[PDB]
Design a protein around this ligand. Structure first.
Ligand code: FE
Ligand code: FE
Ligand code: FE
Ligand code: PT
Ligand code: PT
Ligand code: PT
Lengths: 71, 71, 71
């Protein structure tokens, strides 16, 4: 079920949503919110400041060009 | 091509998917998986625990309120 | 407004996009780009290398199994 709304809401309601985009997907919006968990299966780039409210885990963190595991 | 499915799958299959949402997008699902790379062009907030399986790179990491580049 | 395109673009244009996926969402594409901010309300896993162009903030960072707040 895909509802389009006067007032400007686009609502997709189902069990699973599967997007297969051969080349790319672009989400052009001021803010995107995921209510659950997220997995990224290749890499991540982030331009702006990031806050993690809980602990992060990483094999190493390269800070201002310097190793953290080996500093 | 957008398929809606008895059994509850919503399948969007194309070359590129472009979402232009003037105000916001909200994805309310227990788990979202991206098979490829992801870029976030403003900021990131994450509530729960994060694991990075590979090295991360950052100009600085502010840990429990303390600089890592300058500690 | 949802446009499907010869040439292979799927364009969704509205004020807000709301996805309610009872079980999961999967985005199978080489690259997904968010132009704005992103919040993840549970956890994040990332397989590949991550770059944060700006400072990150975390209560702690567990690097190669070691605490950063308490090392
Ligand atoms: Fe040290
Ligand atoms: Fe130190
Ligand atoms: Fe130290
Ligand atoms: Pt910013
Ligand atoms: Pt959690
Ligand atoms: Pt990679």
């Amino acid at each position: 079920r895909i509802r389009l709304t006067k007032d400007g809401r686009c609502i997709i309601t189902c069990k699973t949503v599967e997007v297969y985009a051969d080349e790319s997907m672009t989400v052009d919006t001021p803010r995107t919110t995921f209510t659950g968990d997220v997995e990224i299966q290749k890499g991540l780039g982030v331009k702006g400041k990031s806050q993690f409210d809980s602990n992060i885990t990483a094999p190493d963190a390269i800070i201002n060009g310097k190793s953290t595991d080996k500093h």
